């Protein structure tokens, strides 16, 4: 499992500098080596989110959750996957869906950042 984590980290470093092609290629190698790890998939979802491809981001998040449900110990990462789907809807101003997925996320694992994002989306929707 060692090499996969090395590949993931080189991908993370690239992602942060906005070098998305490099990030995807290293995450691909990490997935090839450790296919039951949903983190490499959610990381690829982050890359598409930042490229503005919200649909692909959500497709990957759904995929990650599928993989994660197999290993019944990833509740925190599943919460993260749901939150990312929520964020992608938020970016597109599709607030009802953003709120709905933040709730799915919170039910798995409550986090202050997701709660804050949800409250923000709730305030925007309520006013509308």
């Amino acid at each position: 499992g060692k090499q996969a984590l090395k590949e993931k980290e080189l991908g993370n470093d690239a992602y942060k500098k906005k070098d998305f092609d490099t990030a995807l290629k290293h995450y691909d190698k990490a997935k090839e080596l450790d296919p039951t790890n949903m983190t490499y998939i959610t990381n690829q979802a982050a890359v598409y989110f930042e490229k503005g491809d919200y649909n692909k981001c959500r497709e990957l998040c759904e995929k990650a959750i599928e993989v994660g449900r197999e290993n019944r110990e990833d509740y925190r990462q599943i919460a993260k996957a749901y939150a990312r789907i929520g964020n992608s809807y938020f970016k597109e101003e599709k607030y009802k869906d953003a709120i709905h997925f933040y709730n799915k996320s919170l039910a798995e694992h409550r986090t202050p950042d997701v709660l804050k994002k949800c409250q923000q989306a709730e305030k925007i929707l309520k006013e509308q």
């Binding site: 993370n12 982050a46 990462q77 993260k80």
Partner: peptide, 5 residues
């Protein structure tokens, strides 16, 4: 940016 793990 979105957070990576």
């Amino acid at each position: 940016m979105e957070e990576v793990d």
